[PDB]
Write an enzyme that holds these catalytic residues in place. Structure first.
Site, PDB file in Angstrom:
ATOM      1  N   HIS A  70      41.302  35.757  30.967  1.00 19.78           N
ATOM      2  CA  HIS A  70      42.156  35.666  32.182  1.00 19.78           C
ATOM      3  C   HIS A  70      43.578  36.088  31.826  1.00 19.78           C
ATOM      4  O   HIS A  70      44.525  35.304  32.056  1.00 19.78           O
ATOM      5  CB  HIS A  70      42.065  34.273  32.792  1.00 19.78           C
ATOM      6  CG  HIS A  70      40.791  34.033  33.517  1.00 19.78           C
ATOM      7  ND1 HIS A  70      39.796  33.242  32.996  1.00 19.78           N
ATOM      8  CD2 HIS A  70      40.346  34.477  34.719  1.00 19.78           C
ATOM      9  CE1 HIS A  70      38.785  33.198  33.853  1.00 19.78           C
ATOM     10  NE2 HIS A  70      39.093  33.954  34.925  1.00 19.78           N
ATOM     11  N   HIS A  84      42.969  41.789  32.325  1.00 17.44           N
ATOM     12  CA  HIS A  84      42.122  41.409  33.480  1.00 17.44           C
ATOM     13  C   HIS A  84      42.852  41.811  34.755  1.00 17.44           C
ATOM     14  O   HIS A  84      42.217  42.393  35.650  1.00 17.44           O
ATOM     15  CB  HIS A  84      41.797  39.917  33.455  1.00 17.44           C
ATOM     16  CG  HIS A  84      41.127  39.427  34.697  1.00 17.44           C
ATOM     17  ND1 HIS A  84      39.856  39.819  35.059  1.00 17.44           N
ATOM     18  CD2 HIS A  84      41.530  38.562  35.646  1.00 17.44           C
ATOM     19  CE1 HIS A  84      39.506  39.208  36.170  1.00 17.44           C
ATOM     20  NE2 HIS A  84      40.526  38.454  36.559  1.00 17.44           N
ATOM     21  N   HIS A 133      46.655  37.927  40.896  1.00 18.23           N
ATOM     22  CA  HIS A 133      45.667  36.928  41.374  1.00 18.23           C
ATOM     23  C   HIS A 133      45.428  35.820  40.343  1.00 18.23           C
ATOM     24  O   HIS A 133      44.858  34.798  40.727  1.00 18.23           O
ATOM     25  CB  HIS A 133      44.362  37.601  41.809  1.00 18.23           C
ATOM     26  CG  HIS A 133      43.431  37.908  40.686  1.00 18.23           C
ATOM     27  ND1 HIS A 133      43.658  38.926  39.804  1.00 18.23           N
ATOM     28  CD2 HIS A 133      42.256  37.349  40.327  1.00 18.23           C
ATOM     29  CE1 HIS A 133      42.678  38.958  38.916  1.00 18.23           C
ATOM     30  NE2 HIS A 133      41.799  38.008  39.220  1.00 18.23           N
ATOM     31  N   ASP A 134      45.800  36.000  39.082  1.00 19.01           N
ATOM     32  CA  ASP A 134      45.469  35.022  38.006  1.00 19.01           C
ATOM     33  C   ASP A 134      46.731  34.684  37.206  1.00 19.01           C
ATOM     34  O   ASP A 134      46.598  34.149  36.088  1.00 19.01           O
ATOM     35  CB  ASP A 134      44.341  35.540  37.110  1.00 19.01           C
ATOM     36  CG  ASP A 134      42.939  35.131  37.551  1.00 19.01           C
ATOM     37  OD1 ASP A 134      42.804  34.054  38.145  1.00 19.01           O
ATOM     38  OD2 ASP A 134      41.979  35.912  37.300  1.00 19.01           O
ATOM     39  N   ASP A 170      37.441  41.206  41.396  1.00 21.14           N
ATOM     40  CA  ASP A 170      37.594  40.138  40.387  1.00 21.14           C
ATOM     41  C   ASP A 170      36.398  40.148  39.449  1.00 21.14           C
ATOM     42  O   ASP A 170      36.618  39.782  38.300  1.00 21.14           O
ATOM     43  CB  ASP A 170      37.764  38.761  41.008  1.00 21.14           C
ATOM     44  CG  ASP A 170      38.301  37.735  40.037  1.00 21.14           C
ATOM     45  OD1 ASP A 170      38.938  38.126  39.027  1.00 21.14           O
ATOM     46  OD2 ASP A 170      38.109  36.558  40.318  1.00 21.14           O
ATOM     47  N   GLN A 173      23.050  34.738  32.274  1.00 23.03           N
ATOM     48  CA  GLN A 173      23.562  36.022  32.842  1.00 23.03           C
ATOM     49  C   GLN A 173      22.654  36.498  33.975  1.00 23.03           C
ATOM     50  O   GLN A 173      23.204  36.856  35.023  1.00 23.03           O
ATOM     51  CB  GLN A 173      23.733  37.103  31.773  1.00 23.03           C
ATOM     52  CG  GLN A 173      24.922  36.826  30.866  1.00 23.03           C
ATOM     53  CD  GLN A 173      26.211  37.049  31.613  1.00 23.03           C
ATOM     54  OE1 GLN A 173      26.585  38.191  31.868  1.00 23.03           O
ATOM     55  NE2 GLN A 173      26.872  35.964  32.005  1.00 23.03           N
TER      56      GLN A 173
HETATM   57  C1  LIG Z   1      33.434  28.051  34.909  1.00 21.90           C
HETATM   58  C2  LIG Z   1      32.315  28.035  35.923  1.00 21.90           C
HETATM   59  O1  LIG Z   1      32.823  28.758  37.064  1.00 21.90           O
HETATM   60  C3  LIG Z   1      32.446  30.127  37.093  1.00 21.90           C
HETATM   61  C4  LIG Z   1      33.417  30.828  38.040  1.00 21.90           C
HETATM   62  O2  LIG Z   1      33.922  30.277  39.032  1.00 21.90           O
HETATM   63  N1  LIG Z   1      33.616  32.169  37.704  1.00 21.90           N
HETATM   64  N2  LIG Z   1      32.809  32.824  36.881  1.00 21.90           N
HETATM   65  C5  LIG Z   1      32.990  34.115  36.836  1.00 21.90           C
HETATM   66  C6  LIG Z   1      32.194  34.989  35.988  1.00 21.90           C
HETATM   67  C7  LIG Z   1      32.556  36.322  35.870  1.00 21.90           C
HETATM   68  C8  LIG Z   1      31.795  37.173  35.076  1.00 21.90           C
HETATM   69  O3  LIG Z   1      32.118  38.526  34.937  1.00 21.90           O
HETATM   70  C9  LIG Z   1      33.006  39.188  35.841  1.00 21.90           C
HETATM   71  C10 LIG Z   1      30.652  36.681  34.371  1.00 21.90           C
HETATM   72 BR1  LIG Z   1      29.589  37.817  33.267  1.00 21.90          BR
HETATM   73  C11 LIG Z   1      30.293  35.297  34.502  1.00 21.90           C
HETATM   74  O4  LIG Z   1      29.160  34.897  33.778  1.00 21.90           O
HETATM   75  C12 LIG Z   1      28.581  33.602  33.905  1.00 21.90           C
HETATM   76  C13 LIG Z   1      31.077  34.469  35.308  1.00 21.90           C
HETATM   77  C14 LIG Z   1      31.006  30.268  37.598  1.00 21.90           C
HETATM   78  C15 LIG Z   1      30.028  30.781  36.729  1.00 21.90           C
HETATM   79  C16 LIG Z   1      28.709  30.912  37.143  1.00 21.90           C
HETATM   80  C17 LIG Z   1      28.319  30.532  38.465  1.00 21.90           C
HETATM   81  N3  LIG Z   1      26.944  30.710  38.876  1.00 21.90           N
HETATM   82  C18 LIG Z   1      26.450  30.373  40.163  1.00 21.90           C
HETATM   83  C19 LIG Z   1      25.101  30.735  40.162  1.00 21.90           C
HETATM   84  C20 LIG Z   1      24.852  31.269  38.826  1.00 21.90           C
HETATM   85  N4  LIG Z   1      25.981  31.248  38.079  1.00 21.90           N
HETATM   86  C21 LIG Z   1      29.302  30.017  39.365  1.00 21.90           C
HETATM   87  C22 LIG Z   1      30.611  29.891  38.915  1.00 21.90           C
HETATM   88 MG   LIG Z   2      41.023  33.272  39.115  1.00 14.00          MG
HETATM   89 ZN   LIG Z   3      40.411  36.946  38.043  1.00 12.97          ZN
END
Ligand SMILES: CCO[C@H](C(=O)N/N=C/c1cc(OC)c(Br)c(OC)c1)c1ccc(-n2cccn2)cc1
Ligand SMILES: [Mg+2]
Ligand SMILES: [Zn+2]
EC number: 3.1.4.17
Length: 317
Positions: free
Chosen positions: A68, A72, A106-107, A217, A269
């Protein structure tokens, strides 16, 4: 006035493509952003002296976290640049101005922790903003930097344009709260299918701009496999640090964040591509046909993770 940024030929050509990587040379990222503003918006949108002073203050207020970070911020702005260039006539002069700046900001001042960790830690920002905690902070830091002397890149706008652009940026930055994405895309799904979607309805534009923000994003999953694979290391380094901090509060973290469960990442993933990324770029493609290459790139990378699971290659991690 007559001072363009020009990039070397390979960048000049590749920057127009969705899958463009901005490279490892930090010192070209400001020139790349300005280049994009000039072609997307015009050479007149912003006093160059003010834009430069704004870009460098934004850079300073991103921290040295694995993911972040400033890289990014500029990666997300580029994706927004590609969407705007491939949909020339669908967006006002105010929207083009606002959205490139929203993506860059945004971050702002991200510490590498989710809204959820702030809440369990009882971070002061969680008292001040009960939902979309970091996202309200990011909009707050954006307004701060705009109010530094000589940093108001919008000063040439009328009073009512100034209010419209800060409101576009506020909604754009709030929309990067992924908790808000699921419901936003479900509604945009219903509206598209029942044929009720109307881009002259401001509440409809808002929703569509929100989906673009989630698409930009998440755009790391729309790069060529080697970019996507190596960015996932950075993403999981933040997740595992947050998991470590959860264990310090006496809470077992979700598997995604637990560095003792790296073996579960490939299946995790698949989940993410299927639950979040694929549906995001699908609905985006339906509403804005020329964004198809983001969906195709995303499908390619889901298929590369499927191969990681089947042992037909491995992420070193
Ligand atoms: C910290 C937990 O919060 C995460 C968030 O808000 N952002 N995550 C962004 C994110 C970006 C990525 O690349 C741009 C990648 Br690769 C990546 O991998 C896992 C994640 C979050 C992670 C997984 C789920 N999820 C819901 C159904 C299944 N998974 C929901 C939320
Ligand atoms: Mg953010
Ligand atoms: Zn972001």
């Amino acid at each position: 006035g007559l001072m363009q940024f020009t990039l070397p030929v390979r960048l000049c050509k590749e920057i127009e493509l969705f899958h463009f990587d901005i490279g490892p040379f930090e010192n070209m990222w400001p020139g790349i952003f300005v280049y994009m503003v000039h072609r997307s918006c015009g050479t007149s949108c912003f006093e160059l002296e003010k834009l430069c002073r704004f870009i460098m203050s934004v850079k300073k207020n991103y921290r040295r976290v694995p993911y972040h970070n400033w890289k990014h911020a500029v990666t997300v702005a580029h994706c927004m640049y590609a969407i705007l260039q491939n949909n020339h006539t669908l967006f006002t002069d105010l929207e083009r101005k606002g959205l490139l700046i929203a993506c860059l900001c945004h971050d702002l001042d991200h510490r590498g922790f989710s809204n959820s960790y702030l809440q369990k830690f009882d971070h002061p920002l969680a008292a001040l903003y009960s939902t979309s905690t970091m996202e309200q902070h990011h909009f707050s830091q954006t307004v701060s930097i705009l109010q530094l002397e000589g940093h108001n890149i919008f000063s040439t706008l009328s009073s009512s344009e100034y209010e419209q652009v800060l409101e576009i940026i506020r909604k754009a930055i709030i929309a990067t709260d992924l908790a808000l994405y699921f419901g936003n895309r479900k509604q945009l799904e219903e509206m598209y299918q029942t044929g009720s979607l109307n881009l002259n309805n401001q509440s409809h534009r808002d929703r569509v701009i929100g989906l673009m923000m989630t698409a930009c994003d998440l755009c790391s999953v729309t790069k060529l496999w080697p970019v996507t694979k190596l960015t996932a290391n950075d993403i999981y380094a933040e997740f595992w640090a947050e998991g470590d901090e959860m264990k310090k509060l006496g809470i077992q973290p979700i598997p995604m964040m637990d560095r003792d469960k790296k073996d579960e990442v490939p299946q995790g993933q698949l989940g993410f591509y299927n639950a979040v990324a694929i549906p995001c770029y699908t609905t985006l493609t339906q509403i804005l046909p020329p964004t198809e290459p983001l969906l195709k790139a995303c499908r390619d990378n889901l298929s590369q993770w499927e191969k990681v699971i089947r042992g037909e290659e491995t992420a070193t991690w």
